[PDB]
Amino acid sequence: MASETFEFQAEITQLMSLIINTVYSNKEIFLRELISNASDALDKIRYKSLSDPKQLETEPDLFIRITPKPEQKVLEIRDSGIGMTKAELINNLGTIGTKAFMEALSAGADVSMIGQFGVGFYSLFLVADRVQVISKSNDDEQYIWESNAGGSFTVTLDEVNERIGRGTILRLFLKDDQLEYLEEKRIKEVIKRHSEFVAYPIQLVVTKEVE
Amino acid sequence: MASETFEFQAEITQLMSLIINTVYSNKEIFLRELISNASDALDKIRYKSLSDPKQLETEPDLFIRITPKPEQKVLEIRDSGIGMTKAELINNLGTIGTKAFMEALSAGADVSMIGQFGVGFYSLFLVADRVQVISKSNDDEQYIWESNAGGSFTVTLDEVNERIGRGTILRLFLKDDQLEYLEEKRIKEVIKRHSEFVAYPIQLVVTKEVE
Ligand SMILES: CCO[C@@H](O)[C@H]1CCC/C=C/CCNC(=O)c2c(O)cc(O)c(Cl)c2CC1=O
Ligand SMILES: CCO[C@@H](O)[C@H]1CCC/C=C/CCNC(=O)c2c(O)cc(O)c(Cl)c2CC1=O
């Protein structure tokens, strides 16, 4: 199953590089941004479903789910939102707001503003050096978009991950110094602090050895 | 990705049908049998690794993991044991002990003996009307064996489920009256009662909405 490679729009590559290298202290803001995106996508499939009810049948439950995978130093944020087609992943995430945030930043702006420029997605590079966005739109097959903050990303038809009925998974490969975001306590503390007013259930998946 | 269909050896079909239909009370024994199988497979990759250390690299952690999936009425039991090749799944599970258990049964035997006849796998039909066995041996690709207790099963190259590095997942589609096995409390109670002496960590995956 062959990967396709695409070039990032120049300013996006610009944004990603300063973030992956930054010494900024409050890296935990990435989670609010990703939950905010998840909530948005859930709004869209819900609003969409107002006039097209069958759009919900691929995954009737509306949720945001966070799943620590300690062994792989991975953190996943899933939602059963509207999802993105292959062409949406390519367009939305790489090939097409941005520059103005970098300008605000260089003047003293707090990266927490990132979401107000519409580019909070990229805040994930505060805690991760690599990401896979796995997405299933009702309108397309399941696809994997992958980036390590370089100048190019890949998109691959998904034959390796669990089927999500509909929606998007952000699979973050955490940096070695950022492994705290795998911890149930840390995660819950960050959720409560910055994501108080979310319309959808936020589920936390915890793995505990029984005794 | 095309399915292949195989016929069950007659006595196996025999065994499965009486179990899926039985009014037997103590259906919870299925879990000890599946944990026992998981432990066995883990023994085999560990013993195997004694003379062939690199066999462990596909999945360095040795664990048994149970994952309730309430939305799908599914219960998964995973291990990172030795796993089964496509030919092993076909051979082991369908096409090749058994009859003597059915004879013990018809004389008054308790189905809890099933494991002593080497066929405890089939006890899963006490709680499930359908199963998918997903397996990855170091020696083959990932495959899905599926049965609903009929006279035939299917085997399909796996392009739809998460990659397991190595091992086996039993995905049980629980009957409507058996949904109690999705419950953290129930599961823990059954583990402690019948699986006290297990050499490997038994991990329980619990999904909890945060507030
Ligand atoms: C600037 C890049 O574009 C994005 O940020 C957008 C894409 C366009 C805007 C909204 C589209 C609807 C579907 N959204 C998603 O699938 C999505 C999600 O369900 C969680 C996320 O964490 C991100 Cl990232 C995205 C994708 C996402 O939020
Ligand atoms: C009678 C049918 O044969 C089986 O029962 C056997 C297959 C032959 C014996 C042992 C083989 C080593 C690998 N075992 C597995 O992958 C396995 C597992 O890791 C969990 C299970 O729950 C079952 Cl079921 C099996 C498969 C299993 O235990």
Curated annotation (Swiss-Prot), chains A, B:
Q: Kindly list the GO CC terms recorded for this protein.
A: cytoplasm; cytosol; nucleus; perinuclear region of cytoplasm; plasma membrane; protein-containing complex
Keywords tagged on the record: ATP-binding, Chaperone, Cytoplasm, Nucleotide-binding, Phosphoprotein, Repeat, Stress response
Which residues does the annotation say bind ATP?
Answer: E33, N37, D79, M84, N92, Q116, F117, G118, V119, G120, F121, T168
What does altering A104N do? Induces a 6-fold increase in ATPase activity
- Changing A41V does what? Causes a 98% reduction in ATPase activity and a reduced client protein activation activity, leading to growth defect at high temperatures
Using the chain's own numbering, where are the disulfide bonds? Answer: none
What induces or represses its expression, per the UniProt entry?
Expressed constitutively and induced by high temperatures dependent on transcription factor HSF1. According to PubMed:2674684, it is constitutively expressed at low levels, however, due to the specificity of the antibody, this result is unsure.
**GO molecular function: any one?**
unfolded protein binding
* Chief localization: cytoplasm
Q: What does the entry give for GO biological process?
A: 'de novo' protein folding; box C/D snoRNP assembly; cellular response to heat; positive regulation of telomere maintenance via telomerase; proteasome assembly; protein folding; protein maturation; protein refolding
- Compartment(s): Cytoplasm
The family classification in the record reads:
Belongs to the heat shock protein 90 family.
**Known function:** Molecular chaperone that promotes the maturation, structural maintenance and proper regulation of specific target proteins involved in cell cycle control and signal transduction. Undergoes a functional cycle that is linked to its ATPase activity. The nucleotide-free form of the dimer is found in an open conformation in which the N-termini are not dimerized and the complex is ready for client protein binding.
Q: What else is known?
A: Present with 444943 molecules/cell in log phase SD medium.
Record note on quaternary structure: Homodimer. Interacts with the co-chaperones AHA1, CDC37, CNS1, CPR6, CPR7, HCH1, SBA1, SSE1 and STI1. CNS1, CPR6, CPR7 and STI1. Interacts directly with the substrates GCN2, HAP1 and STE11.
Free-text note regarding domains: The TPR repeat-binding motif mediates interaction with TPR repeat-containing proteins like the co-chaperones AHA1, CDC37, CNS1, CPR6, CPR7, HCH1, SBA1, SSE1 and STI1. CNS1, CPR6, CPR7 and STI1.
State the name under which the record lists this protein. ATP-dependent molecular chaperone HSP82
Instruction: From the UniProt record, report the name of the gene that encodes this protein.
Output: HSP82
